[PDB]
Amino acid sequence: LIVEDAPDHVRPYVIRHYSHARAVTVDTQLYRFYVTGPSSGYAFTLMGTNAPHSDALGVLPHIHQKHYENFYCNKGSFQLWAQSGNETQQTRVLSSGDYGSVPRNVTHTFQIQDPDTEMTGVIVPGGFEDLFYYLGTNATDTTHTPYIPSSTISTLQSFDVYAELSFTPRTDTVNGTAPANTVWHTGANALASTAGDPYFIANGWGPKYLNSQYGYQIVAPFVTATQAQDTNYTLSTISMSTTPSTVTVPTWSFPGACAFQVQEGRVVVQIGDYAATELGSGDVAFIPGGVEFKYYSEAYFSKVLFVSSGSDGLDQNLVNGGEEWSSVSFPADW
Amino acid sequence: SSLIVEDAPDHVRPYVIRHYSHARAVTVDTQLYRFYVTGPSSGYAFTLMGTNAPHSDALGVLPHIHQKHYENFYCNKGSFQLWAQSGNETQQTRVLSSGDYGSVPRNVTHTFQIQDPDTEMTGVIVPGGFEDLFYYLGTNATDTTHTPYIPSISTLQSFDVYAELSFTPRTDTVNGTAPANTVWHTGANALASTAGDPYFIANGWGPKYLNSQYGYQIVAPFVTATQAQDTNYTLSTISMSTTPSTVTVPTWSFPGACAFQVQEGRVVVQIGDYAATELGSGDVAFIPGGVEFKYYSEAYFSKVLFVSSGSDGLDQNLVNGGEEWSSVSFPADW
Numbered sequence: 149l150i151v152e153d154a155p156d157h158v159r160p161y162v163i164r165h166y167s168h169a170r171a172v173t174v175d176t177q178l179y180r181f182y183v184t185g186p187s188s189g190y191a192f193t194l195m196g197t198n199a200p201h202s203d204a205l206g207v208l209p210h211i212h213q214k215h216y217e218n219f220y221c222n223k224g225s226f227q228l229w230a231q232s233g234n235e236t237q238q239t240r241v242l243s244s245g246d247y248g249s250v251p252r253n254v255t256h257t258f259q260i261q262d263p264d265t266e267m268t269g270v271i272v273p274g275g276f277e278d279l280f281y282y283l284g285t286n287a288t289d290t291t292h293t294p295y296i297p298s299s300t301i302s303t304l305q306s307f308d309v310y311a312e313l314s315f316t317p318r319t320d321t322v323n324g325t326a327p328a329n330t331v332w333h334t335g336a337n338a339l340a341s342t343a344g345d346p347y348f349i350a351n352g353w354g355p356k357y358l359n360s361q362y363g364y365q366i367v368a369p370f371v372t373a374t375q376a377q378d379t380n381y382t383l384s385t386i387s388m389s390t391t392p393s394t395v396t397v398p399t400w401s402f403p404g405a406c407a408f409q410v411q412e413g414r415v416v417v418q419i420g421d422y423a424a425t426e427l428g429s430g431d432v433a434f435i436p437g438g439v440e441f442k443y444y445s446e447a448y449f450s451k452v453l454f455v456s457s458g459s460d461g462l463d464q465n466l467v468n469g470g471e472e473w474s475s476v477s478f479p480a481d482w
Numbered sequence: 483s484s485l486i487v488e489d490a491p492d493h494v495r496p497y498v499i500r501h502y503s504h505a506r507a508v509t510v511d512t513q514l515y516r517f518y519v520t521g522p523s524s525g526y527a528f529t530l531m532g533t534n535a536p537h538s539d540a541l542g543v544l545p546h547i548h549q550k551h552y553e554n555f556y557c558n559k560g561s562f563q564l565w566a567q568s569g570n571e572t573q574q575t576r577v578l579s580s581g582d583y584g585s586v587p588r589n590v591t592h593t594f595q596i597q598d599p600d601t602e603m604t605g606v607i608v609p610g611g612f613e614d615l616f617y618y619l620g621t622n623a624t625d626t627t628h629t630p631y632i633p634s635i636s637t638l639q640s641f642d643v644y645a646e647l648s649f650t651p652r653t654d655t656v657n658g659t660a661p662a663n664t665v666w667h668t669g670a671n672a673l674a675s676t677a678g679d680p681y682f683i684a685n686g687w688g689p690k691y692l693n694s695q696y697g698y699q700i701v702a703p704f705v706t707a708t709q710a711q712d713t714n715y716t717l718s719t720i721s722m723s724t725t726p727s728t729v730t731v732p733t734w735s736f737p738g739a740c741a742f743q744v745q746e747g748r749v750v751v752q753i754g755d756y757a758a759t760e761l762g763s764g765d766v767a768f769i770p771g772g773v774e775f776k777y778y779s780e781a782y783f784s785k786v787l788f789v790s791s792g793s794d795g796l797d798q799n800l801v802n803g804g805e806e807w808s809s810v811s812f813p814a815d816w
């Protein structure tokens with residue numbers, strides 16, 4: 149079940165945090181491809197980027213006309229700038245557990261701030277990694293260190309990267325956000341109600357739902373049908389209690405492929421005809437559409453970043469079967 | 483007898499206690515405290531505790547000093563602000579996010595305020611036994627489900643808590659710090675030049691050392707003999723690569739007790755005659771002085787918060803045998 153690089157075809161698998169994962173470097177940045185187009189049947193790409201502080205932008209401002217980009221900060225911190233059409237340009241400094249949503253046709257760029265920064269990208273549809281094989285240089289990285297210590301515009305268009313050379317990232321950031329009057333780590337964040345608009349959710353400040361059918365699970369939606377539209381997927385974090393003795397761990401099966409990366413805790417996953425395996429920080433589990441699976445938290449509290457192809461995968465299912473909830477913690481009693 | 487315990491033992495012995503175990507939980511208003519290492523369990527060497535709490539618009543504790551205990555604040559997740567002042571020196575304050583550290587020596591006035599919804603503070607207090615104060619002021623908590631937190635003057639001198647009613651937490655915070663002429667997440671941080679002064683180290687910005695004897699390990703000191711003086715302990719984070727197949731995992735036996743809490747990764751500990759046991763996020767291992775033990779990272783990269791009684795524990799040993807290093811990542815080649 150465990151693999152060192154994402155398979156070159158669809159199958160159940162788990163890839164440990166910092167596994168080789170076809171690693172490439174672009175300057176100081178090291179990219180790992182935990183889920184690829186070939187490994188997901190082109191459903192989505194799930195990549196991890198580790199990098200040190202930089203005084204320069206990490207990528208030139210650009211747009212994707214056919215890909216929805218999602219930025220999740222695993223650790224450290226990076227600034228993200230985003231703008232849809234003539235809407236006011238927005239920017240936030242994401243720290244651990246923060247999220248930034250970048251729908252198609254939204255200009256964006258980012259800059260790495262902290263020394264031990266890790267950015268997990270979820271891009272829909274999959275196959276997006278080809279861009280980095282081109283821009284990057286293969287890295288053997290024998291020791292598995294997070295990152296190594298120390299015409300083109302036309303070409304990029306074929307990778308669905310359209311340069312926005314006139315975009316000037318705003319420079320009036322204060323307390324991790326701009327413009328003024330925005331809410332960042334000081335109040336609730338809502339997902340954009342209008343398709344096409346970027347939005348940001350600070351860790352623990354977005355909408356949540358408690359599902360109590362199989363133990364306590366809290367789903368914090370990041371992307372729903374409203375925002376995905378035809379890109380057809382869902383994204384969220386799922387926090388989990390242990391499974392009480394009175395509950396039978398359920399067996400799931402969905403039409404679309406799905407995957408999750410453990411952020412905190414220890415989660416056991418059983419997929420298809422493979423032995424159960426326990427995942428820790430940054431480990432990724434990939435479940436092909438149509439394959440049965442079971443999971444439970446061995447830790448008293450675990451939190452995972454979850455993505456699903458389709459409108460009704462696991463996270464949406466738990467939300468529908470649960471209730472609105474206003475805490476990152478579940479009830480103290482069963 | 484078993485290695486893993488749900489509450490710290492009432493005497494010195496090797497043990498592991500999982501994140502969010504009962505650990506003699508108590509609540510003080512919205513804050514839930516867990517005592518992973520106590521005075522009794524460590525022979526009064528030190529206390530290692532965890533506090534989980536939601537956002538609050540008020541201070542989490544009234545300003546105070548401890549005349550006989552050295553307090554240490556480490557942000558596991560979320561964020562909280564910490565204010566500190568020593569004698570005639572300028573009052574300092576920082577907003578700590580994941581991986582950040584704040585040092586509060588004896589006789590330093592301090593207070594804190596919880597900012598994010600899913601905030602966890604790991605406290606290391608030396609010497610051990612101060613936790614009686616939390617038992618005293620707190621209300622016992624059963625917390626059957628092990629949820630992180632429950633959703634929703636003269637007298638204290640005996641517990642070494644001295645009120646400082648004249649202290650007014652400064653309110654000119656900008657970009658997570660005050661006064662303006664400080665460095666926070668924008669440059670290198672040094673440990674205080676002498677004992678008695680508070681200091682703060684942002685994640686990855688403090689001094690680091692690379693030890694290459696047993697695979698690669700990076701030690702980021704937080705407290706050294708210079709700052710500890712007679713409190714006689716060391717504190718740091720230790721980052722670890724896997725152990726090369728050609729390297730024998732070393733065995734250690736120190737004069738004083740030591741412990742660590744995994745922050746990221748998967749670390750296996752083999753203590754005395756107990757079974758090798760793998761720890762995940764927030765899990766704590768405690769090793770009595772004089773007891774042999776081995777540890778190694780199963781994850782490709784793990785980072786733990788480490789504390790040791792004495793001046794020459796594991797972290798100091800790794801520093802003395804290693805070299806100065808300027809990256810949070812280790813070399814790509816053995």
Ligand SMILES: *[C@@H]1O[C@H](CO)[C@@H](O[C@@H]2O[C@H](CO)[C@@H](O[C@@H]3O[C@H](CO[C@H]4O[C@H](CO)[C@@H](O)[C@H](O[C@H]5O[C@H](CO)[C@@H](O)[C@H](O)[C@@H]5O)[C@@H]4O)[C@@H](O)[C@H](O[C@H]4O[C@H](CO)[C@@H](O)[C@H](O)[C@@H]4O[C@H]4O[C@H](CO)[C@@H](O)[C@H](O)[C@@H]4O)[C@@H]3O)[C@H](O)[C@H]2NC(C)=O)[C@H](O)[C@H]1NC(C)=O
Binds near residue numbers: 656
């Ligand atoms: C809290 O934290 C936030 C960060 O989260 C801090 O925000 C930072 O604040 C500083 C200072 O305000 C910002 O830097 C300044 O940015 C100015 C605008 O830059 C853009 O426009 C210029 C003009 O066309 C371009 O050249 C720039 O391009 C370069 O930078 C971008 C990055 O944004 C790169 O992508 C490019 O490749 C380029 O490298 C930008 O597009 C900029 O004009 C200004 O530069 C002056 O000042 C610096 C030193 O501060 C000098 O080195 C430089 O020579 C300039 O000096 C002239 O102008 C100043 C101002 O009028 C005069 O005083 C001088 O005498 C001289 O005439 C500087 O770079 C920064 O962008 C911003 N960061 C973010 C993310 O928002 C907050 O300050 C902080 N708050 C507190 C209180 O601490």
Ligand SMILES: *[C@@H]1O[C@H](CO)[C@@H](O[C@@H]2O[C@H](CO)[C@@H](O[C@@H]3O[C@H](CO[C@H]4O[C@H](CO)[C@@H](O)[C@H](O)[C@@H]4O)[C@@H](O)[C@H](O)[C@@H]3O)[C@H](O)[C@H]2NC(C)=O)[C@H](O)[C@H]1NC(C)=O
Binds near residue numbers: 657658
């Ligand atoms: C960036 O984020 C900062 C937080 O990290 C923001 O700082 C906050 O700024 C507000 C507004 O200036 C402060 O609130 C005000 O505080 C003053 C002073 O409070 C103290 O003194 C009064 C009077 O003696 C006393 O009653 C209080 O108890 C305090 O002891 C009040 O007079 C105002 O009414 C108001 O409450 C916050 O205190 C301050 N927070 C911190 C932690 O510093 C900053 O404003 C943000 N900057 C921007 C541009 O958005």
Ligand SMILES: *[C@@H]1O[C@H](CO)[C@@H](O)[C@H](O)[C@H]1NC(C)=O
Binds near residue numbers: 213252253344
């Ligand atoms: C994105 O922009 C292109 C160019 O205008 C347009 O043809 C396409 O329909 C847009 N796609 C979406 C999802 O808005």
Ligand SMILES: *[C@@H]1O[C@H](CO)[C@@H](O)[C@H](O)[C@H]1NC(C)=O
Binds near residue numbers: 170281
């Ligand atoms: C680099 O790795 C990619 C796989 O991501 C592969 O397609 C290519 O052949 C490799 N190129 C070189 C020069 O090794």
Ligand SMILES: *[C@@H]1O[C@H](CO)[C@@H](O)[C@H](O)[C@H]1NC(C)=O
Binds near residue numbers: 403405437458
């Ligand atoms: C959305 O994805 C699901 C699962 O991959 C698939 O069954 C469904 O046909 C898709 N919807 C559309 C309109 O393509």
Ligand SMILES: *[C@@H]1O[C@H](CO)[C@@H](O)[C@H](O)[C@H]1NC(C)=O
Binds near residue numbers: 549588589
């Ligand atoms: C702390 O302050 C008390 C009271 O002033 C003093 O007696 C004691 O020696 C001080 N301790 C340290 C370590 O500075």
Ligand SMILES: *[C@@H]1O[C@H](CO)[C@@H](O)[C@H](O)[C@H]1NC(C)=O
Binds near residue numbers: 569570
């Ligand atoms: C601090 O200043 C006071 C006077 O306000 C003085 O009495 C005291 O000795 C000073 N502290 C030190 C350590 O010098």
Ligand SMILES: *[C@@H]1O[C@H](CO)[C@@H](O)[C@H](O)[C@H]1NC(C)=O
Binds near residue numbers: 623625
């Ligand atoms: C505290 O302990 C008492 C005695 O065991 C128990 O009755 C009570 O329910 C406990 N309080 C809480 C909040 O758990």
Ligand SMILES: *[C@@H]1O[C@H](CO)[C@@H](O)[C@H](O)[C@H]1NC(C)=O
Binds near residue numbers: 738793
């Ligand atoms: C410091 O701690 C070590 C380890 O517990 C102990 O052996 C030593 O005696 C202590 N030093 C002093 C001065 O007490």
Ligand SMILES: [Cu+2]
Binds near residue numbers: 212256
């Ligand atoms: Cu992009």
Ligand SMILES: [Cu+2]
Binds near residue numbers: 592
């Ligand atoms: Cu204190």
